[PDB]
Ligand binder design. Structure first.
Ligand code: BNG
Ligand code: BNG
Ligand code: BNG
Ligand code: BNG
Ligand code: BNG
Lengths: 309, 309, 309, 309, 309
């Protein structure tokens, strides 16, 4: 018959979410409860009812006793897992109580940047049994699993946490146990508002103020320089994300400001060309130039907002 | 009954405070005194009264003797703890004297940037007993704990150090011992004064000098370029901090310079529009333009200083 | 006679491809099946038919039994290989079943940037037997080897995966077994289109719009500044690649924009010099200046497209 | 009575001095000679007179023989100490000969940037005995300690090396031995001359050349832009140093160029305002403007040179 | 008498050459052949003639047998040496066959940047015997040592490889064996040509084209801005190299462009001052201004080329 292995995983800290590399890093405690009757022992009066072991000698004890332990893997782990504690407490009964305190990076393959920076992402940790379900079956260790109260993450905000069990077929032909700790997190928009939206909007608004000066040459030079500023913001954004094969809401927004600014240069070159090809006309054309600018940006804003919502 | 475990923690060095990642790094010595009568030994005349052990063989001796050691965790530790010394001295009595010299990063979840750069922060180290208070009770090892005299931190200045004991319920249902080393540190303002305040103030003051040249076009071009410079300083500041969900005193200060500069462009466009819509007037309007500038910045400065103090 | 060693390698994750350093990083599982009759054992009823060992004690068992294991090396590995699992399952028969879960960087020496960013690259992992083919022969472990379904790579797209066996002569004079896991990957052009092509094309197109303003001085200043922008893009590109000894398609493209922009400055200086050396002429010369610009870029485009295709 | 422990430390390489983090990194060999009569042995003819041990088994031999070794700590060490060799050679006499080859970062808390880049710094390595002077006394191992002949440091130049012994009271109430390897190093000014002094001086000198063009507006625009360039150099310098709480000679130098440039803008605005408020006057005022510039920078240079020397 | 230790070192990969830190990184295989008659063993018919050992148990076997192994150090190694394989094969004879597969950084103290980027550098690996020549003598293991055929280095190109033996006196008074693997490598100029020479030459050439426009003010503004561009290229170069105490050919080249550009500003200010102090003169002076520019750069080019060749 298969022995129940009680898996518990608790994330104490989120040391960071690296969206460029699509991974996240946590400080966590893994807890396992497993009754192996073969490991049971008799004790004399005064001798302890609970034997405490360093994982190293406990595994050496299992090999001696010819017992198979529920060998597991953190399926989505990346790099080195720095350990803090790897402790076993064995009861007279044969109940193994294991605690694994670690710091580790995990793959975040659920990353969908299509609505960035208004995106919500899924992060998970996969704990797999190397041995199949006929030998060991993972069960949910009750009242332990989840996320702590001092995670230390400032940009992201965890919306919900879930735990479930599923099968995997990584090394075996038959199904094998898999414990899942899943969490959803959305972004704090403050950075994007302060460093990207407000500056881009200011550049556009204060640039429009200068149309009231009535100098066509100055306008063309202003829109030309604005175009270079947006090209620069385009690089600022690209540095936050991986070199995706798809368009972001942010990408569409920047490409949008390029297209409008390109057309502002085109329009004002065209209006100056009309002045040159024929006083009351001059001031009549000026009205189009001044009212074109806000209408072009308001038309662009309605285009993205429709294309993404 | 529970055995007293004497915890002592001394921070020799502050290898750095990383405010972007909200963690800090220290070189520290952990000292433990624990009397276990079961570990007592008899010695012959001339044979040593104190046995010195490498942690590895000492733990192997405890497992042999079926003794439970006060297994502890640095609760707020992050990543790898690089060890220098892990030495045990066991007296004839059974008094275990442990020394743990390490370099490690620790989570700084008490980070409040709301008044940055005039902020004071709390940094702590949590040492938790894995076993509950019925088995082991942490006591304060007197005359050891604290912070050294060559911490090597240049930006920060430690205001006070404290040590206290508390309970935690991390792995157990019953209360478990927790030793706390807390320290408060405030910032040296010299960097911010030299690299941010003085430059921003100079750009504003020397830009005002040019108003006395009496060219409205040149003023609009000056404020426009100044706006771009502040957008650039805005990115310089954002790189020091995490992508917070809240507004900083620094953030308010930069958004403030944007708003005033935006209004300077607006005002000077408006004053040039007034000149155009009707000599003594010209020079009368000029007085408003020249006196507007200092009043706008002095009004902005009074707004933030009120909003934050 | 030589014993068959069954090699299986599966890449679960592509943690990244670093083209500047010409290496790649993976999370992978190595699986080995090897029958050693000497390791066979007899068991009593109830005693397990499969013995599970930590690599450490299994190798200690081989040394004891004076047995030689199929010592292997990942020939193209770089730096530290962080291990997750190193587990042995030994059957009554003497069939050793080994699993090696690791994270590691590997040399990518097949990097050909000649057609970058339209390039396709070869990535491989070499598993070599230290002992020659007369002792051990590598065989392909069927139904395991390949690449997973959640690799997590966003810029690159895997076109095909292959496994084959070959000989090597690294440490021996006689041939020795080598297992190869090869994969081809092409690039997602979206980043290059959004951040390099569209901006460069916009700068060129909107700059041409201003020729219709009919100011020769303004044109020379525009082309001069455009040249500096391309010099800046030239540095942006150079940061993505190693300091190659050969010319890239991208390199040719940027050198191309330099040459045309240099000639635009030369041509417009020449046309202004013609105006100065002799009204209907002025406007006749203007036609050449305006039609020169698109023809020069269309001539350049045809030159690279011919030189590379 | 106390046993003499002979400490020898030789720095083979200076892998770098990181002034921003106030630490330095070395490749070094630690050598210890210690006679423990208890470790003495008898040998048969043909059997070796010197027993060679890996530190691991030598410490296991000491624990067996119940001997206390002179446990030491590198007091100012930071992070991980990567070891190359840890070898023991035990003579028939009981003379332990230990060699420790390592790569490690050490705290440089003696960093005084007040006269940077004309600064001289003190770097040291502290080797402390964990046990007090009544048990073990550190002595200077003659003819070994110092700094090698291929250190590999290019910016810094070692002026002198010293070795001495002192007491410490880190873990004990009674004095404990401390071995000190100290070295002084001064900086090669070439980088600062080529990248900071020459450019700043050129910008100032070639900007003065344009005063001979006799355009007041052009001068104000030139000094304004120069001010921005110095603000940029100010950030270039700040990146080399920690965020100190004190003013550097370099800091004073840059603040100096700001103040003079601010006054150049002020003066030329004032002189243009004098022209406007009343031909031979014009050309008379021009002389003040042209001779002001060199006198202002020569007055600034005399101010810093007095304030720091 | 002394026992011959056969050293073989083969570099499989050059993971990089870091010229800023003056070190290089390799993947290499170290091979040792050493006959120790004391390690010889007798075997029964059918029992193996070759015993295979993990370094750990082989060293434990040497300590047991009271044998001294040829303890060695990679003298110029830096940081951690990540190992792949550490395997021993012991023949009936007592012939120890050792293989050490590693990834490691090594000090490159032979770095001479005086002719950069036209420089050729020496890179080496030093393998030293800890024990002197009376105990162990290093010999060249024939047909193994050298550099592989898939080094993966793109900027550098290996000109020649050499192996030799020498003495050292690092830990001993008497001479001790040292094995040396040396290689010379020169640089691929393509990066410097594409990113530094072509842009600098273009800026100079296209700037000269505008002299034919005949505007003295525009020329002074052009040379002024060019000076700032070169100051920027000066920082781009400085980032590639350490903060050397000597002048590079590249450094001389950039300082050269500063001096000429400074003189171009000086000359054109002077020529405009001559126009102002006295039509056919105007156009006569113009010839000097236009022909000065190419002569000044051609004179500068001949100065460096003479000073360095
Ligand atoms: C920058 C947006 C500010 C709008 C208000 C108009 C004042 C002028 C701002 O400066 C100008 O900005 C252009 C575009 O960025 C540059 O081409 C130009 O060289 C620079 O002098
Ligand atoms: C900018 C702070 C210094 C103010 C002193 C006045 C002299 C001119 C300085 O150059 C100015 O730089 C801005 C930013 O690039 C441009 O927008 C502006 O058109 C330009 O005139
Ligand atoms: C940038 C191309 C945009 C084309 C639209 C025409 C308006 C002017 C854009 O500003 C230009 O920016 C360059 C930046 O280097 C300067 O050198 C150049 O003198 C300036 O005129
Ligand atoms: C700038 C140092 C070299 C001085 C030599 C005189 C020629 C003009 C150089 O161009 C200057 O470039 C600055 C860039 O910031 C502008 O602000 C300023 O208005 C402009 O005149
Ligand atoms: C840049 C070299 C190109 C040569 C061809 C002349 C066209 C004008 C290019 O813009 C120039 O950029 C310089 C650097 O910022 C400024 O100093 C200068 O006043 C400005 O006119």
């Amino acid at each position: 018959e298969p022995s129940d292995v009680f898996i518990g995983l608790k994330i104490d800290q989120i040391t960071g979410i690296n969206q460029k590399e699509e991974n996240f890093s946590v400080v966590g405690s893994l807890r396992i409860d497993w009754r192996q009757p073969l490991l049971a022992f008799e004790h004399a009066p005064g001798e302890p009812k609970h034997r405490t072991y360093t994982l190293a000698t406990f595994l050496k004890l299992l090999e001696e006793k010819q017992i198979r332990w529920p060998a597991f893997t953190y399926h989505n782990q990346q790099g080195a897992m720095d350990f803090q504690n790897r402790l076993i407490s064995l009861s007279e009964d044969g109940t193994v109580m294991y605690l694994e305190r670690f710091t580790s990076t995990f793959q975040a393959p659920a990353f969908d940047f299509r609505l960035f920076p208004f995106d919500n992402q899924l992060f998970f940790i996969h704990v797999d049994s190397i041995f199949p379900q006929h030998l060991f079956r993972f069960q949910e260790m009750q009242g332990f699993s989840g996320l702590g109260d001092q995670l230390g993450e400032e940009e992201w905000i965890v919306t919900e946490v879930n735990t479930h069990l599923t099968t995997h077929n990584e090394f075996t032909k038959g199904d094998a146990s898999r414990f899942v700790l899943e969490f959803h997190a959305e972004r704090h928009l403050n950075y994007y508002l302060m460093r990207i939206l407000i500056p881009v909007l200011l550049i556009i608004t204060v640039s429009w103020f200068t149309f009231f000066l009535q100098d066509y040459t100055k306008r063309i030079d202003l829109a030309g320089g604005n175009l270079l500023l947006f090209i620069a913001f385009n690089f600022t954004i690209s540095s936050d994300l991986p070199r995706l094969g798809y368009i972001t809401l942010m990408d569409a927004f920047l490409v949008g400001t390029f297209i409008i600014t390109a057309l502002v240069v085109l329009g004002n070159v065209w209006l100056r060309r009309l002045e040159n090809h024929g006083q009351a006309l001059a001031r009549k054309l000026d009205i189009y130039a001044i009212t074109s600018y806000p209408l072009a940006y308001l038309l662009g804003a309605l285009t993205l907002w429709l294309l993404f919502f």
